[PDB]
Amino acid sequence: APSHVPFLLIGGGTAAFAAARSIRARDPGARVLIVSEDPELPYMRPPLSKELWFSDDPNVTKTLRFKQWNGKERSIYFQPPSFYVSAQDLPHIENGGVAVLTGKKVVQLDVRDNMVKLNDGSQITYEKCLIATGGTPRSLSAIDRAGAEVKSRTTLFRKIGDFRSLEKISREVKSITIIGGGFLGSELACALGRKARALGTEVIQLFPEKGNMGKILPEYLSNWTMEKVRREGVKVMPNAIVQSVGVSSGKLLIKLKDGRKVETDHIVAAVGLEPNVKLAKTGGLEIDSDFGGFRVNAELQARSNIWVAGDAACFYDIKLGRRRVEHHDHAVVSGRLAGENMTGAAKPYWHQSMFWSDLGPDVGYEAIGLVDSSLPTVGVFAKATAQDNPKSATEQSGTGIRSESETESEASEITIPPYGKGVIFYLRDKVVVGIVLWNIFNRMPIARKIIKDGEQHEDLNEVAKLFNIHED
Ligand SMILES: Cc1cc2nc3c(=O)[nH]c(=O)nc-3n(C[C@H](O)[C@H](O)[C@H](O)COP(=O)(O)OP(=O)(O)OC[C@H]3O[C@@H](n4cnc5c(N)ncnc54)[C@H](O)[C@@H]3O)c2cc1C
Numbered sequence: 001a002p003s004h005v006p007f008l009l010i011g012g013g014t015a016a017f018a019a020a021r022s023i024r025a026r027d028p029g030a031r032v033l034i035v036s037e038d039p040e041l042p043y044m045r046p047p048l049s050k051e052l053w054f055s056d057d058p059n060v061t062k063t064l065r066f067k068q069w070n071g072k073e074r075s076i077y078f079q080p081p082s083f084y085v086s087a088q089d090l091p092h093i094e095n096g097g098v099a100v101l102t103g104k105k106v107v108q109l110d111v112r113d114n115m116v117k118l119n120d121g122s123q124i125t126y127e128k129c130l131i132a133t134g135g136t137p138r139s140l141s142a143i144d145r146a147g148a149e150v151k152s153r154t155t156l157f158r159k160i161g162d163f164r165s166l167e168k169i170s171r172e173v174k175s176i177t178i179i180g181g182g183f184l185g186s187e188l189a190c191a192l193g194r195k196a197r198a199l200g201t202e203v204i205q206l207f208p209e210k211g212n213m214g215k216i217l218p219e220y221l222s223n224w225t226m227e228k229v230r231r232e233g234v235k236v237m238p239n240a241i242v243q244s245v246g247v248s249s250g251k252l253l254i255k256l257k258d259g260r261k262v263e264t265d266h267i268v269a270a271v272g273l274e275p276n277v278k279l280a281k282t283g284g285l286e287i288d289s290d291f292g293g294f295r296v297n298a299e300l301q302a303r304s305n306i307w308v309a310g311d312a313a314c315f316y317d318i319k320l321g322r323r324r325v326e327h328h329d330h331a332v333v334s335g336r337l338a339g340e341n342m343t344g345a346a347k348p349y350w351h352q353s354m355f356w357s358d359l360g361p362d363v364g365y366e367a368i369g370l371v372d373s374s375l376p377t378v379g380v381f382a383k384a385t386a387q388d389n390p391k392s393a394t395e396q397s398g399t400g401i402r403s404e405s406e407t408e409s410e411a412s413e414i415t416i417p418p419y420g421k422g423v424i425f426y427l428r429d430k431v432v433v434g435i436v437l438w439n440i441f442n443r444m445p446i447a448r449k450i451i452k453d454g455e456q457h458e459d460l461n462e463v464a465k466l467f468n469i470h471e472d
Contacts (some may be wrong), residue, residue: 001087001101001104001118001120001122001124002033002087002088002090002091002123003091003123003124004091004124004126005019005031005032005033005090005091005124005125005126005406006030006031006032006127006128006131007023007030007031007033007126007127007128007129007130007342008033008034008035008116008124008126008128009032009035009129009130010035010106010116010129010132010133011034011035011036011037011040011128011131011132011133011134011276011310011312012035012036012037012038012040012041012100012102013036013042013043013045013132013310014042014045014078014310014328014331014332015046015130015132015134015309015310015311015312015331015332015334015335015338016034016036016042016130016132016310016335017034017042017078017079017335017340018309018331018333018335018336019130019132019307019309019335019336019338019342020032020034020098020333021336021339022116022336022337022338022339022340022343023098023339023342023343024067024096024097024098025339026230026339026340026343026345026424027343028095028096028268029095030206031090031091031093031096031097031100032096032097032098033087033090033101033104033124033430034098034099034100034101035100035101035102035104035105035116035118035124036100036101036102036103036104037103037104037105038102038103038159038160038161038163039102040077040159040160041077041078041081041084041100041102042077042078042079042100042101043064043076043077043078043119044076044077044078044328045158045159045328046073046078046328046401047076047218048157048159048160048162048163048190049184050187050191050400051066051067051068051069051240051400052064052076052163053096053167053191053192053194053195053281054067054360054361055067055193059244060167061151061163061164061167061168064076064077064160064163068399068400069358069361069391069395069397069400070163070388070391070400071395071396072398075243076160083098083325084097084098084099084100085097085098085099086099086412087100091305093343101118104118104119104122105118105119106118106119106121106279106280107119108282109279109282109283109285110282110283111283111284111285111303111306114126114127114129114301114305116129120454122211126305127305127340128305128307128343129305129307130307130308130309130335130338130339131294131302131306131308131312132308132309132310132331132335132338132343133275133276133277133278133279133305133312134273134275134276134310134311135274135276135311135312135326136274136276137157137158137269137270137273137274138269138271138272138273138274139156139271140179140242140269140271141270141363142242142243142244143243143245143267143269145244146244147246148247148266149247150245150246150247152161153165153252153265153266153267154266154267154269155169155266155268155269155270156269157184157188157269157270163459166192166266166268169265170192170195170196170199171195171199171268173201173265174201174202174265175201175202175203175204175251175263175264175265175266176192176196176201176202176203176204176264176265176266176267176268177203177204177205177206177252177254177262177267177268177469178192178203178204178205178206178267178268178270179207179242179267179268179269179270179271180205180207180269180271180272181207181208181209181211181213181214181238182207182213182215182216182271183213183216183355183357184270185205185207185212185271185318186205186212186213186225186229186266186357186359187357187358188268188270189203189205189229189232189234189236190229190232190234190359190360192234192268192387193229193232193233193234194232195359196233196234197205197232197233197277202235202264203234203235204234204235204236204237204262204264205229205234205235205236205237206236206237206238206240206242206254206256207237207238207240208238208239208240209238209239209445210222210223210238210239211223211225211226211228211238211442212225212229212236212238213225214238214373215372216367216371216372216373216374217365217373217424217436217437218361218377218379219373219422220379221379221422221424221436221438222373225359227240228359228363229359232360233307237256237260237262239258240256240258240260241256241257241258242254242255242256242257243255243256248263249263251263251264251265252264252265252266252267252386253408272395273311273326273461274292274349275292275293275294275311275312275314275324276311276312277292277293277294277312277430279295283302285302285305287314288301288314288322288324290322291314291322291323291324292314292324293308293311293312293313293314293324294308294312294313294314295314296308296313296314296315298348298349299341299346299347299348299349300315300334300337300338300341300349301341304472307338307342307381308338309331309334309337309338309344310330310331310334310335311324311325311330311331313334313417314401315334316349317351317352317353318350318352318452319352319369319433319454320369320451325353325355326355327353327354327355327403328355328356329351329353329354329355329403330351330353332403333349333351333353333408333418334349334351338352350370351370351408352410352448352451352452354366354367354368354402354403354406354444354447354448355367355368356402356403356406358390358400360390361389361390361391361394362389362390362391363389363390363439364389364393364402364439365435365437365438366402366406366436366438366444367434367435367436367437367442368434368435368448368451369426369433369434369447369451370426370428370434371424371426371434371435371436372426372434375426375427375428375433375434376426376427377420377425377426378424378425378427378460378469379423379424379425380422380423380425380460380464380466380468381419381422381438381468382419382420382421382422383419383420383421384421384439385421385470387441388420388421388439388441389439389442390441391401392441393405393441396441402441405441406441406442406444406445407444407445409445409448410445410449410452411445411446411448412449413449414446414449414450414453414455414466416462416463416465416466417465417466417469420439421439421440421468422434422437422438422439422440422464422467422468423436423437423438423440423447423464423467423468424436424437424438425457425460425463425464429456430456430457431454431455431456431457431459432450432451432457432460432463434451435447435450435451440467440468441471443466443467443471446466446467450463450466
């Protein structure tokens with residue numbers, strides 16, 4: 001570990017990588033150190049629950065290369081390992097570079113001193129610091145009460161190391177249970193379900209809601225989604241609240257509050273995240289008590305020379321106010337912006353971050369703004385053409401990272417032109433405050449503009465025609 005680095009990026013995920021890239025774009029002599037508690041160099045998370053499981057290629061667990069839905073291979077890593085310089089070389093190497101200290105954790109932050117201390121005792125001073133620590137998976141309290149035998153047979157799915165362990169479990173055991181009905185839980189259900197159809201084994205998905213993604217999607221589409229996951233072979237148990245987990249026979253026994261017993265060999269928990277804010281206390285840094293995460297100003301600053309980006313940040317959304325998100329898009333754009341600000345840009349974060357999820361190559365969702373199933377919603381559906389699927393969208397764009405194909409921009413203008421797919425408008429009064437797109441692609445710029453303008457929209461059916469017609 002060097003003693004000092006001009007740019008110190010704490011955490012080695014998506015936000016950290018985008019900030020490193022941005023810093024080096026604006027200052028090509030810059031010396032950037034990423035400190036990553038994981039053994040792996042920076043990598044994107046979306047394939048871990050999607051294309052890596054759909055690959056029929058051997059070796060996938062070793063190589064972490066995946067085929068997109070269009071059949072083109074891509075690495076999980078943001079860049080080849082050859083592109084980084086060594087941490088030892090970074091302070092003096094000609095033209096600077098980006099180094100990663102892997103397997104190291106920042107445990108203390110000294111803001112007054114512009115210094116951090118690592119788990120190994122090392123001290124690093126900085127000029128400009130980014131906190132991009134992401135978040136930690138939530139447990140289920142019934143699992144924490146359970147024996148050591150239960151805990152060792154529970155995966156909190158989040159990293160490469162979890163893909164590798166679970167993929168092997170999937171080939172060894174007869175039954176895996178996913179707890180959580182959210183996008184990630186549902187992705188993993190389809191993933192494991194596909195492998196289990198091959199092996200003749202069992203996959204269960206359980207959650208308290210009436211259908212998959214029940215907190216976000218309206219009842220019709222949530223149920224549709226549950227049927228789709230069931231068509232994959234998965235036993236989906238909605239209305240399921242876990243009372244306890246123990247052991248009975250040679251199995252884990254999950255007892256639901258309603259009396260149902262579920263027997264299984266392994267549990268995967270996908271019940272959300274908590275931002276990694278441990279450094280706030282030594283730092284004296286403000287955390288948002290309502291939403292979680294480090295509070296940041298318009299420019300993503302927590303202090304004059306500390307920025308925060310990605311899952312860890314609680315920022316003021318241009319239209320929603322204070323919020324935190326768990327969006328790949330946000331981690332990329334806020335990371336990039338934080339890097340620009342670290343190099344003097346003084347730019348505010350005005351981005352409206354999008355989210356996507358794929359349940360295999362034939363089903364895709366996108367979301368933007370305030371998407372909460374308890375709001376009044378208006379769904380406008382149409383029938384799918386051959387191109388209304390994540391596969392075609394990947395084929396047209398060359399990428400399956402939907403935030404790249406959609407673009408980050410908002411449309412210039414909205415003027416109106418005089419089920420398998422659709423748009424769901426989420427309303428506050430009769431203002432569209434959020435939108436979900438189901439099998440509709442390359443219209444995020446439009447959805448951003450509709451939410452941004454915040455006009456009253458009486459006839460949402462005319463507005464829907466922007467989504468339901470060809471792109472095109
Ligand atoms: C399996 C999975 C699938 C997903 N799929 C999608 C998707 O399809 N679409 C979508 O929009 N989003 C998706 N997401 C969400 C998206 O990946 C996250 O929003 C994104 O990773 C956030 O990036 P980040 O840099 O803020 O945090 P991360 O990428 O989580 O990186 C944070 C890093 O910092 C490290 N760290 C934490 N504390 C310290 C410390 N004190 N010292 C050193 N290192 C530290 C952590 O180990 C971690 O590596 C998915 C997430 C997961 C887990």
